[PDB]
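Hi W.,

Here's what went into the run:
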Amino acid sequence: LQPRTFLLKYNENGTITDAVDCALDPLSETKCTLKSFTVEKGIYQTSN
Amino acid sequence: AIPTNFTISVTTEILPVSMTKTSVDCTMYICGDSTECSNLLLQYGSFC
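Here's what came out:
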């Protein structure tokens, strides 16, 4: 196990359905910064 | 009083249009690249 920072997406019923890492891909870091799974077109600034 | 002769007179006129597109990152500014400061700044919230 690694020290991570996940983003857990619960559902209507109440269990963790999907999740996304915050170091897996830069797009995953993008979703981790935008705080959602809908990343529209455009340049985002996530980290350094 | 009717004018009898004219004069064309160029007059400059300066206008600002844009400033420098700055950008500031919390964790590098608020924290001197330390980790404990990063824990605390994550405890504060969604200011960044």
